[PDB]
From Swiss-Prot:
Organism listed in the record: Rattus norvegicus (Rat)
Domain Follistatin-like: 2-25
UniProt subunit comment: Interacts with GDF11. Interacts with activin A/INHBA. Interacts with myostatin/MSTN.
Cysteine disulfide links: C3-C14, C8-C24, C26-C58, C30-C51, C40-C72
Name by which UniProt lists this protein: Follistatin
Transmembrane segments annotated in the record for this chain: none
Glycosylation sites (chain numbering): N32
Biological function: Multifunctional regulatory protein whose primary function is to antagonize members of the transforming growth factor beta (TGF-beta) superfamily including activin, myostatin, GDF11 or bone morphogenetic proteins (BMPs). Mechanistically, binds to these ligands in the extracellular space, blocking their type II receptor-binding site to inhibit downstream signaling. Plays an essential role in muscle fiber formation and growth both by preventing the repressive effects of myostatin and through SMAD3/AKT/mTOR signaling independently of myostatin.
Length: 73
């Protein structure tokens, strides 16, 4: 019933939802990133930046990566 003493692991952080229940939500660390502009994902969708691609990777697509820098065609 609280975020205290709850370890979500790497890439996740605990957060209380609208029901006062602690949940592990995707909170990827993006400090290691080099290119800071938009990136084209292996799903063919552009992401405003890699940080966002990592969030989506963690939330829905495990095999998602950057297939090239810049916007997708």
């Amino acid at each position: 019933e609280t975020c205290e003493n709850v370890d979500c692991g790497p890439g996740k952080k605990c957060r209380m939802n609208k029901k006062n229940k602690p949940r592990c939500v995707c909170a990827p660390d993006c400090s290691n990133i080099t290119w800071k502009g938009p990136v084209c994902g292996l799903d063919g969708k552009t992401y405003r930046n890699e940080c966002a691609l990592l969030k989506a990777r963690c939330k829905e697509q495990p095999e998602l990566e950057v297939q090239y820098q810049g916007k997708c065609k």
